[PDB]
From Swiss-Prot, chains A, B:
Organism this protein belongs to: Bacillus subtilis (strain 168)
SUPFAM superfamilies, sorted: Double Clp-N motif (SSF81923), P-loop containing nucleoside triphosphate hydrolases (SSF52540)
Protein name in UniProt: Negative regulator of genetic competence ClpC/MecB
UVR domain segment(s): 415-450
GO aspect biological process, one term: establishment of competence for transformation
Region (I): 161-408
SMART domains in alphabetical order: AAA, ClpB_D2-small
Upper classification of the organism: Bacteria, Bacillati, Bacillota, Bacilli, Bacillales
Family under the similarity heading: Belongs to the ClpA/ClpB family. ClpC subfamily.
Region (II): 469-653
């Protein structure tokens, strides 16, 4: 463990004393034994002395074994035996509780480690090996705390508390309990519901979930001192443990008998508080089958206020309790439960910081902690508000410890050397090559010790790293699943969205800033952190931006939903379909849209082409744009809170598409920019509603296939070519000159970014592949796509 | 076998020594026995010396049996008795461990082989048979290699580490464990989670289905060399396996008890790591029923980081564990896992080459590994990227070893000869035929030995064949199952695609090259290896190519899906074919398209008539064409990555029936052709979106055909005709003259190579059948359909 108590460590160290004092150059097990008895009256020492083995008998034997007197010690270390006695005692102290290790455990461990020299010393001195282990054991000394033993007696208190179960108050009066951080404000509202007896019973309804039980520990504590009513005179709080009841009975009838028995002993009534966890399950109300029907005893118990109790139920479970009534409802009574808010989250993190010292990789920083919470809270969100957080802390709370030993100065090389030695050595001893092996051992064990020395020279790499969890550290980890490298994502959002997305710098910056505005909590984020209309012809920058947003906001690109509203049809297909039209919009509301965004809570919902794609859909989406929610799928609420709603359009497209390229225009270009930033968003308005648009964060125009925007679409598609072939092993690069020649062919006033795929396909994919067919390039060489003089040329550079 | 130790073999060989030295024509068991005791102090020998059976006692009995004087010792081999002892001992040493037979096993085996000459020698010399077999056994301490035995240590470690389990770490120190190749990049992020305390649990989410258990070996190894974190410098890695828990238990209550005890023993805390496969199952993993509700113990165990544990969870199941919280979600952490890419595949294969040395058509070649891998990985594809591969390697890695012994010069005939002998002899001995039986044995056993001598002369046919597993070998086998004779299929694709699309050489060569382009790693395999539209009139080469491509790429024609998009038009066939097919394109997405192509992954998706199929179809096809995926059927991903999208269409019909016809002019023909490969592809654009067409890899017109090309379509139809009649034994052949007469019909602007089917039907099946009925020809005659003076005449050539 490396955390041992003195008594152990001292008897062990006393061995080393005998090592040199007798010369035994490896500190033997005989010396560990001497160690016990020469340490006088530790439990080990004492023990041996009980059986009659004083220091006198032991050293007399010991000196007659290895004895004299080469006072040094060889690398002053132990015998392997003696090292075993230390390992053993540690476990012999685990067994006997003891987190650390005490004297006894060393003698106990000696007996255990019985081929050791000590063992034989004692078996020579007339005392059986087991007589020695006996003595130590029966003087059971180990680490202690959590005292609650001093003798106790009562009469009637016996029947209740036996069964079933732990007493929450008890564990909080010896404080082996911890607060734990709630869910504090809930507790006051419970004591209102509890210092009752006309409806005696609190019943907590809500998500369970971070630990319902935190509220419960609340009650215990407040019921003792002193804000507790005299309504609640001389109360005791006792907790239900379902697990003990079911265990050892293995039948429902027996289980019922035990619960019945408990209800009877509750006859101490009007002075008792019962905590019933999962209170509905016992009542057994509703469903196809019940849920366990303890209810026969439990229901009248609840009514009487003898089982004046606190019920911990769940969202559906309360329904299934008032469903019985009026004693499972005229006793029962629901209460609004807390699950920790964002600020509470931060506090929890820190609260368990100090136990992360056990792994030594966080404690600190606060700033990082905040990140854990906040960045996660707003951007995915795949856990609850504090759970998300803590996971990030620890995630980063290891991350740097990995970079520690991946790169110290890399005495990883040291170990690498030591390897080569052993081999040489080994095989040399085997080859003979004998004295040529000699030196090979010596070089080996030299190395071994050096190796071990420089890996604990990276205890300096520990005192450097072994507890922080920094801003960036947490933030990067927050990006890995999902302040610094999530808020650097936020601050540098424009930069990040541009680096994947096209020459529609107008569009990128508008979206970037609009999301970054909301996502930093200064603009309405109850509804998407950006609602948008993305105008432009398809493949221009629109989709690409949806992707880049996912990437920047959440730290992963693949948190992007994508629904085509135009695909929902049969919405006027009365008898036209056949005789009924069962489906598509019904599928979208009733299942698809609501389930999907509920699945990935935050995610770029990319709602394709809603230019005329069921005018009802725009209203449905409007509720998302306003509230951040839709209610469909028979009562599910889908949170589009920090989704990025991107509603696409290609009705403005025509003007967005327009040129800026030379070779054919020099004045239409400087009339295409200015034209697109006004005209596009107005072909939009006719294709939507202003009511829709009013709940949108910003209306984005993707000035496209410019001069400029083209050679960036070409650089996305062509770069996807050069990358998709490397898995199958081909290295492609297009020079800027070759990406340019393709870009000329997607522009004018008319077309889209549609012909760009086809021409990239032709000039890169098809051409290179026809270039493997012509033998200039091959598979797995580097292919530079160049222009020779105005005629295309595929060059090779590998 | 051949897996024998010396001592065994030596006592046995000593038998042969006695064979001639005492003269035993076949050297009895008595000589093996003499062998044992004269080999002195091998365990058999040694044993006999205990029983009192020195060389003295044995040889006196032996010499009184035979003892003299067949000094030649007839073709010096053993007796069947003595041979039995050798066969027996090998296994009598397997039985007692040993894969290499020791002395003991031969004496043990003598007793076993107790009728034997040896056995009887000893039972004559006063030593009971079991007293002897005992003696060897009680002087055989048995093997202790591959293990470590010298004593034990430790106390508390006992209950935990016992249970439960194998311990990969043990086999990874004292090697017996595989590397494995991995799934290496997963391990850093995993070790990150064991360098933590709020997070504690790495939890691997992905297909299980990657050989997840390989990753598990990862930790052990990596915690050793060379990244060593602070708590993972005192961590131990312990494996928990479900299989031992279920066995001998057979009760859920008992199962819970066993787990509770284990979890309790984890009190060695802050020093232990638990590997839990199927971590979700224990938690409850949502659902309509629990998956096991170990969760009660498991959750606090997860939270403290006492049981920092490693979760192997499934796609839905993980969701249903992080939902439980905040200990099955606090500890939890998702991680990105690997299922091998093509390069990784290759490396695994090679690593395990050396053990199908044993399969003697393997180990080697590298190039063969590559063939296996690359061809399966990219082309159908029925497992994971390395599993597919090795089956092909190994297929071939035996295949030629089969050709070894089914084609040497085929000394199988020898055995055939030997048959006639034995019989003749046998029956001759029974009839008598005294000397007529005599000579028959002599011919029999002479022959027999010659056979066997030359069957192991094809150990030269082994020394010839027994490694190598080449490219081509693999490739042919990959075609057998489903990188030379699959990449020769690619390079020579034009020949292969033409041999069924005999006609439209223009079209064929474009497609051939387009797939061959992609499959050689330089085109687009993200998109289908070739997406195409094959334009043409039906029954011209279009469909026929879809098949021929399947054949060439996958080695099988029938890996071809086939969807009519005009049926999934939701307005062409929703109300004149079917009732309510959830609004027909909804049927296609929601079920049909996605299920079909997902079943055979890289199937030729053959999309009929995309002229009109509703504009909704074209978006879906565009996505198939672009991404190489479609996502439908409530979250299924259907892989169109290296599918062959082949879309047929009569879209530009007029040109797709303006053949190559002599009718208008003979200067019209290569002007119907060249014209058709341009004019069609613009009616294509008019009938369906250009955006769709731009992600198509190449737009093929599979021309409408006029002789030249007709008489080659006629020759496909006629060859399909004549061949389906061979199964029921009716042989037809058409002369080239007759294939010409049918082609005149397929001429003109007015039709393609369409009318040809009816006219092959009429002129081959129907005409030959009306001639088979007229007695001009008969069944199973080779039936020549010939032209006389310009009209058919059926000739016979049988």
């Amino acid at each position: 463990f490396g955390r041992f108590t003195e008594r152990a460590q001292k008897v062990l160290a006393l061995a080393q004393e005998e090592a040199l004092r007798l010369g035994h150059n490896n500190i033997g097990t005989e010396h560990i034994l001497l160690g016990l008895v020469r340490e006088g009256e530790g439990i080990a020492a004492k023990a041996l002395q009980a059986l009659g083995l004083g220091s006198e008998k032991i050293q007399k034997e010991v000196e007659s074994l290895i004895g004299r007197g080469q006072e040094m010690s060889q690398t002053i270390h132990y015998t392997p035996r003696a090292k075993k006695v230390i390992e053993l005692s540690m476990d012999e102290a685990r067994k006997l509780g003891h987190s650390y290790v005490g004297t006894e455990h060393i003698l106990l461990g000696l007996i255990r480690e019985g081929e050791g020299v000590a063992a034989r010393v004692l078996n020579n001195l007339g005392v059986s090996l087991n007589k020695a282990r006996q003595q130590v054991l029966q003087l059971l000394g180990s680490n202690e705390t959590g005292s609650s033993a001093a003798g106790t007696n009562s009469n009637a208190n016996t029947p209740t508390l036996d069964s079933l179960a732990r007493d929450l108050t008890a564990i909080a009066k010896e404080d082996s309990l911890d607060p734990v951080i709630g869910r504090s404000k809930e507790i006051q509202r419970v004591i209102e519901v509890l210092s009752r007896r006309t409806k005696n019973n609190p019943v907590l309804i809500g998500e369970p979930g971070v630990g319902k039980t935190a509220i419960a520990e609340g009650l215990a504590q407040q019921i003792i001192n002193n804000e507790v009513p005299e309504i609640l005179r001389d109360k005791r709080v006792m907790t239900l443990d379902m697990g003990t009841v079911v265990a050892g009975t293995k039948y429902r009838g027996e289980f019922e008998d035990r619960l019945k028995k408990v209800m009877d002993e509750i006859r101490q009534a009007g002075n008792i508080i019962l905590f019933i966890d999962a209170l509905h399950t016992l009542i057994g109300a509703g469903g196809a089958e019940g849920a366990i029907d303890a209810s026969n005893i439990l229901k009248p118990s609840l009514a009487r206020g003898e089982l004046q109790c606190i019920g911990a139920t769940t969202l559906d479970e309360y329904r299934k309790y008032i469903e019985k009534d009026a004693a499972l409802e005229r006793r029962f009574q629901p209460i609004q439960v807390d699950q920790p808010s964002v600020d509470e989250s931060i506090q929890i993190l820190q609260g368990l910081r100090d136990r992360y010292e056990a792994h030594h990789r966080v404690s600190i920083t606060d700033d990082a902690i905040e990140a854990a919470v906040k960045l996660s809270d707003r951007y995915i969100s795949d856990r609850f508000l504090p759970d998300k957080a803590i996971d990030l802390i620890d995630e980063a709370g290891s991350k740097v410890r990995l970079r520690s030993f991946t790169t110290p100065p890399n005495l990883k090389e040291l170990e690498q050397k030591l390897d080569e030695v052993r081999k040489e050595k080994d095989a040399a001893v085997q080859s003979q090559e004998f004295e040529k092996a000699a030196s090979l051992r010596d070089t080996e064990q030299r190395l071994r010790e050096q190796v071990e020395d420089t890996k604990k020279s990276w205890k300096e790499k520990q005192g450097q790293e072994n507890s922080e969890v920094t801003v960036d550290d947490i933030a990067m980890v927050v990006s890995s699943w999902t302040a610094q490298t999530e808020t650097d994502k936020l601050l540098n959002m424009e930069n990040i969205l541009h680096s994947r997305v096209i020459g529609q710098d107008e569009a990128v910056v508008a979206v970037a800033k609009a999301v970054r505005r909301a996502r930093a909590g200064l603009k309405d984020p109850k509804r998407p952190i950006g609602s948008f209309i993305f105008l432009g012809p398809t493949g221009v920058g629109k989709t690409e931006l949806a992707r880049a947003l996912a990437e920047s906001i959440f730290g992963d690109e693949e948190s992007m939903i994508r629904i085509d509203m135009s695909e929902y049809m049969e919405k006027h297909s009365t008898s036209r379909l056949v005789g009924s039209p069962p489906g598509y919009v019904g599928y979208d509301e009733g299942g698809q849209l609501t389930e999907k965004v509920r699945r990935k809570p935050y995610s770029v919902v990319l709602l394709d082409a809603i230019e005329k794609a069921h005018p009802d859909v725009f209203n449905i989406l409007l509720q998302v744009l306003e509230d951040g929610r839709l209610t469909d799928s028979k009562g599910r609420t889908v949170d589009f809170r920090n989704t990025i709603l991107i509603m696409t359009s290609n009705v403005g497209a025509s003007e967005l598409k327009r040129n800026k390229y030379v070779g054919f225009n020099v004045q239409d270009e400087t009339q295409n920019h200015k034209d697109m930033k006004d005209k596009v968003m107005g072909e939009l308005k006719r294709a939507f509603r202003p009511e829709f648009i009013n709940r949108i964060d910003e209306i984005i125009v993707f000035h496209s296939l410019e001069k400029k925007h083209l050679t960036e679409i070409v650089s996305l598609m062509s770069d996807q070519l050069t990358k998709r072939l490397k898995e199958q092993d081909l290295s492609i690069e297009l020079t800027d000159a070759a990406k340019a020649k393709v870009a000329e062919e997607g522009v004018d006033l008319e077309y889209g970014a549609r012909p760009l795929r086809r021409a990239i396909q032709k000039h890169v994919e098809d051409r290179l592949s026809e270039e493997l067919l012509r033998g200039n390039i091959h598979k797995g060489q580097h292919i530079v796509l160049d222009v020779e003089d105005g005629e295309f040329v595929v060059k090779t550079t590998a």
